[PDB]
Amino acid sequence: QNFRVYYRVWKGPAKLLWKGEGAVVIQDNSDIKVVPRRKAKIIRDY
Amino acid sequence: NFRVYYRDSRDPVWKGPAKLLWKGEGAVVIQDNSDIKVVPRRKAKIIRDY
Amino acid sequence: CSPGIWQLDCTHLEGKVILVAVHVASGYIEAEVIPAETGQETAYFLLKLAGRWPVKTVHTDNGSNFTSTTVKAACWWAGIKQEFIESMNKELKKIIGQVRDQAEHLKTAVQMAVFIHNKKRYSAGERIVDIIATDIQT
Amino acid sequence: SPGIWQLDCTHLEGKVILVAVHVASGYIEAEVIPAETGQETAYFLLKLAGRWPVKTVHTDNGSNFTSTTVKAACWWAGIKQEFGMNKELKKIIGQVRDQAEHLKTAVQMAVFIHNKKRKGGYSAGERIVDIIATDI
Ligand SMILES: Cc1nc2ccccc2c(-c2ccc3c4c(ccnc24)CCO3)c1[C@H](OC(C)(C)C)C(=O)O
Ligand SMILES: Cc1nc2ccccc2c(-c2ccc3c4c(ccnc24)CCO3)c1[C@H](OC(C)(C)C)C(=O)O
């Protein structure tokens, strides 16, 4: 289960770290950040 | 070769493939099974087979 | 062998119309979500299908959309005969249900499910190309 | 070559035709879409990928192709996107255009004509299935 978040006009893919109640902590390049849950969709792979 | 689909009333439904006999400015004469029929050009869809 | 035999069906889901083509021999699926269950839409579908696969025969029900003159026209043009098991259709519904929440739009879920179905293993996606290929090559 | 495709937008009659070429075989898929958006492009790509083993897609810097919706589709399915028979298609559409009311109908007619045509010496429709089949 490899998950990809596209975040906040959209940005991604960024690598899933932790998803919590109202936000998800994520990073791609080096910049770790936290975005509120609902506008940072998480779609897996096949 | 050429197939004509036509409306031969107000418009219940386009009527099935009919043979093109003659196509003129304002009308087309077609044969549907045994029946020669005349419809306006504007009530006639004429499609050439692939 | 039946390389040219397909089946056409309409499912309703979330007050929308999914149109499904099954290549009977391989179990392969194409699907499109359409705005209306019309003969125009059905026929335009059939054209797309026929330009992509060697389609000899299409199995359908007495659906007004399938008995429509637009569909008949498409068939005559492309040289498809129209005739008047459905586990690949019911399986598709299942998979859509499974993946439904993964995507916003139903259409996205449908195409996801088609992809899942064709690729699962061997696979229907492989079987169809194999079948069609062996029919051209022999 | 098996799995390499190219994606392009033509504009015609103030409409957007989206075209996929399987580079190896010359085979075509096309769809007329309401807007030149990334959403539409991506939904196209999903349909394409569910039907063919598509590994790599070549596109331009089109805002629709550089759109994340498209990126998302690619990552989800298997597809690498590169940024570094189309002209024939336009020709055929022109030829058949008057035979049908709607441009979309003309486009699909033209696709059919193109894929089924031979050089008598196989058709593109045949070449692609052959290629994919021999692969696996
Ligand atoms: C609008 C229409 N309206 C119609 C009304 C009655 C009968 C056919 C149509 C046809 C028609 C149907 C099937 C075909 C056609 C072809 C050329 C031209 N028209 C059609 C070749 C492939 O198969 C069509 C075509 O449109 C649909 C495909 C959306 C139905 C068209 O654009 O002419
Ligand atoms: C609305 C959206 N909005 C988006 C905004 C940003 C990024 C992607 C999307 C995506 C998206 C893109 C690619 C995918 C998706 C999958 C599941 C869910 N959404 C998507 C699996 C297949 O590949 C989507 C999806 O819709 C489109 C297909 C019209 C883009 C969706 O329905 O969620």
Author numbering:
A (entry chain C): 221 to 228, 234 to 271
B (entry chain D): 222 to 271
C (entry chain B): 56 to 139, 151 to 187, 194 to 210
D (entry chain A): 57 to 140, 154 to 189, 193 to 208
Please share excerpts from the published article on this structure.
HIV integrase (IN) inserts viral DNA into the host genome and is the target of the strand transfer inhibitors (STIs), a class of small molecules currently in clinical use. Retroviral IN proteins consist of three well-defined structural domains: an N-terminal domain (NTD, residues 1–50), a catalytic core domain (CCD, residues 50–212), and C-terminal domain (CTD, residues 213–288). The CCD adopts an RNase H superfamily fold and contains a D,D-35-E motif that binds Mg2+ or Mn2+ ions, which mediate DNA cleaving and joining events. ALLINIs promote IN aggregation by stabilizing an interaction between the catalytic core domain (CCD) and carboxy-terminal domain (CTD) that undermines viral particle formation in late replication.
